[PDB]
Each structure stands twice: as structure tokens, then as C-alpha cells.
Design an enzyme around this catalytic site. Structure first.
Site, PDB file in Angstrom:
ATOM      1  N   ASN A  10      31.679  32.557  40.790  1.00  0.00           N
ATOM      2  CA  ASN A  10      32.848  32.439  41.855  1.00  0.00           C
ATOM      3  C   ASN A  10      32.390  32.288  42.847  1.00  0.00           C
ATOM      4  O   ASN A  10      31.858  32.585  43.613  1.00  0.00           O
ATOM      5  CB  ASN A  10      33.771  33.209  41.838  1.00  0.00           C
ATOM      6  CG  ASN A  10      34.689  33.705  41.887  1.00  0.00           C
ATOM      7  OD1 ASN A  10      35.995  32.586  41.108  1.00  0.00           O
ATOM      8  ND2 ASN A  10      35.454  34.160  43.153  1.00  0.00           N
ATOM      9  N   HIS A  80      41.941  37.021  39.738  1.00  0.00           N
ATOM     10  CA  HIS A  80      40.909  38.155  40.571  1.00  0.00           C
ATOM     11  C   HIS A  80      41.651  38.915  41.523  1.00  0.00           C
ATOM     12  O   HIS A  80      42.575  38.545  42.678  1.00  0.00           O
ATOM     13  CB  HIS A  80      40.562  36.735  41.125  1.00  0.00           C
ATOM     14  CG  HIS A  80      38.885  36.689  41.447  1.00  0.00           C
ATOM     15  ND1 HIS A  80      38.694  37.492  42.535  1.00  0.00           N
ATOM     16  CD2 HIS A  80      37.606  37.064  40.755  1.00  0.00           C
ATOM     17  CE1 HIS A  80      37.135  37.920  43.243  1.00  0.00           C
ATOM     18  NE2 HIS A  80      36.483  37.721  41.582  1.00  0.00           N
ATOM     19  N   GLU A 152      36.120  43.939  36.923  1.00  0.00           N
ATOM     20  CA  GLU A 152      35.824  44.286  38.169  1.00  0.00           C
ATOM     21  C   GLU A 152      36.404  44.831  39.029  1.00  0.00           C
ATOM     22  O   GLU A 152      36.954  45.014  39.548  1.00  0.00           O
ATOM     23  CB  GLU A 152      35.583  42.757  39.264  1.00  0.00           C
ATOM     24  CG  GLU A 152      35.267  41.652  38.377  1.00  0.00           C
ATOM     25  CD  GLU A 152      34.488  39.998  39.445  1.00  0.00           C
ATOM     26  OE1 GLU A 152      36.108  39.893  39.216  1.00  0.00           O
ATOM     27  OE2 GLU A 152      33.872  40.108  39.618  1.00  0.00           O
TER      28      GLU A 152
HETATM   29  C1  LIG Z   1      30.505  38.788  48.536  1.00  0.00           C
HETATM   30  C2  LIG Z   1      31.084  38.586  46.795  1.00  0.00           C
HETATM   31  C3  LIG Z   1      29.794  39.524  45.904  1.00  0.00           C
HETATM   32  S1  LIG Z   1      30.480  39.966  43.861  1.00  0.00           S
HETATM   33  O1  LIG Z   1      29.632  39.863  43.377  1.00  0.00           O
HETATM   34  O2  LIG Z   1      31.117  41.029  43.948  1.00  0.00           O
HETATM   35  C4  LIG Z   1      31.059  38.515  43.656  1.00  0.00           C
HETATM   36  C5  LIG Z   1      32.423  39.012  42.799  1.00  0.00           C
HETATM   37  C6  LIG Z   1      32.931  38.482  42.251  1.00  0.00           C
HETATM   38  O3  LIG Z   1      33.814  37.288  43.512  1.00  0.00           O
HETATM   39  O4  LIG Z   1      34.249  38.624  41.081  1.00  0.00           O
END
Ligand SMILES: CCCS(=O)(=O)CCC(=O)O
Length: 232
Positions: A10, A80, A152
């Protein structure tokens, strides 16, 4: 056995594309680079690795989707974390965006996930399932071939606090079990459920070993190469 895994990034963008282009990937895995609108055209122009596809983000307009397809964009990320907690997209707004994208012939990575307080109070299950049930309400069975779920935990995004393998596996399994029950065990067995939130080179491999982990969503960074390699 597991369906084809996915490694999705992403969003210097040129040096990263150079690195991906020169990377040999032996095993079967779909790679995705999700770019913001302003960087879409350049990414497609530069990224020629055939195991990579380009993804748009957040498009919700009928003409916008149409134009993206026209331009050769067939993947999109929706729902997201910040869309929900900052921009104000509800479960239903995300679900409507997902149904629209699928109708316009998109593969869709739909993101769900609970907040810190929801996790602490033991409400992870109710929250994530309410989010996916909203998505499923706007889809027919056949639509799921076009869908990918990204789990997530909001508290793990960009914080440096990764979910443990136990935490990720438990979440993924309750998602898959709900899909099995409500949609069909056939759909459940083919569904890619990806983990995201502080995935890195060191921890990705261990996470993928978990029964219900089918890949990752992570930031566009040099270590993304190692995350791709960890999908086995
Ligand atoms: C600064 C982002 C670190 S991260 O790996 O948690 C991003 C995860 C995502 O954008 O879904």
C-alpha cells in the site's frame, strides 16, 4: 492446501520499482502495488514485472472506475483503516464501494479490522464480522472469486506493533469460519485472507506459517522484497 498467496504494498518510488523489476520470484504469488491516483500512471509505466499488478485505491465514482479499467487498472484497495477512522466511510459505504468495483470488473482487496479499544474490551470478533457482513450483504456468491480480504488491526498499522502469530491466526480463522457458514465452504477454502499491520522482513515468514494466513498488506518499502519471499 492454501490458495495462491498475495503480497500487496500500500503506497523514492523509482528506485523501488527498479528493485521490484530486477527481483526474481520463483514460487507462485500475486504481487500488488497499490498507488494513490497521483502516482498511478507513472507506476504502470515503470513497473513491468509480470507477477505484479497495479491497484487503485478508494475510487467510488462510477466514471472513475470506468476510466481506471480503460487505463488498464484491474485491482483496487477499499476500506483501508484511515478511510473509516478519519474520512468517515461507514461499513455500508465501504460495502457499496466494493460491490461497485466488482460490478465494473475489478479484483478487490477489502480491508477490515478492529481498534485498540475494541481489541482490549474483547470485541474484535463482533466488530470485524459486522464489517465483513456489511460487505457480503451487497455481493452474490459468485462475486467472491473477485474478492480478497485484508485483516488489519488498527493498532498495528504504522505503529510498529505487529500482531503475534496467535493473534493473526485467531482473527483469520474466525473470518474464514464466518465465510464458510454464511457464504459456503467452497468460497471459504479459496478466499485469500491477508494480514497487515507492522509486517516486516523479520516477522513475515513466521506469520505465513499460520494455517489461515494467505499473504500480507504492507508499505511500499525496500523490505517488501523479503515479505514477498516470506509467502512460502
Ligand atoms: C507505516 C505503515 C506500516 S504498515 O506496515 O503497518 C502499513 C500497513 C498498511 O498500509 O496496510
Amino acid at each position: 492446501s492454501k490458495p495462491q498467496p498475495i503480497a500487496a504494498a500500500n503506497w523514492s518510488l523509482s528506485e523501488l520499482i527498479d528493485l521490484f523489476n530486477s527481483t526474481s520470484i520463483n514460487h507462485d504469488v500475486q504481487c500488488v502495488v497499490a498507488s494513490t491516483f497521483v502516482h498511478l500512471a507513472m507506476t504502470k509505466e515503470r513497473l513491468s514485472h509480470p507477477k505484479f499488478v497495479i491497484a487503485a485505491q478508494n475510487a467510488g465514482n462510477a466514471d472513475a472506475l470506468a476510466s481506471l479499467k480503460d487505463f488498464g487498472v484491474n485491482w483496487i484497495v477499499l476500506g483501508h483503516s484511515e478511510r473509516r477512522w478519519y474520512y468517515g466511510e461507514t461499513n455500508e459505504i465501504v460495502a457499496d464501494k466494493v460491490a461497485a468495483a466488482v460490478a465494473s470488473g475489478f479484483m478487490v482487496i477489502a480491508c477490515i479490522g478492529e481498534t485498540l479499544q475494541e481489541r482490549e474490551s474483547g470485541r474484535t470478533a463482533v466488530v470485524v464480522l459486522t464489517q465483513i457482513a456489511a460487505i457480503a450483504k451487497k455481493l452474490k456468491k459468485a462475486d467472491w472469486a473477485k474478492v480478497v480480504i485484508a485483516y488489519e488491526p488498527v493498532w498495528a498499522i504504522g505503529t510498529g506493533k505487529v500482531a503475534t502469530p496467535q493473534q493473526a491466526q485467531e482473527a483469520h480463522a474466525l473470518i474464514r469460519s464466518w465465510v464458510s457458514s454464511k457464504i459456503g465452504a467452497d468460497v471459504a477454502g479459496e478466499l485469500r485472507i491477508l494480514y497487515g499491520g507492522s509486517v516486516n522482513g523479520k516477522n513475515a515468514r513466521t506469520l505465513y506459517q499460520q494455517r489461515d494466513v494467505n499473504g500480507f498488506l504492507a508499505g511500499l518499502k525496500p523490505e517488501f522484497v523479503d515479505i514477498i519471499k516470506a509467502t512460502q
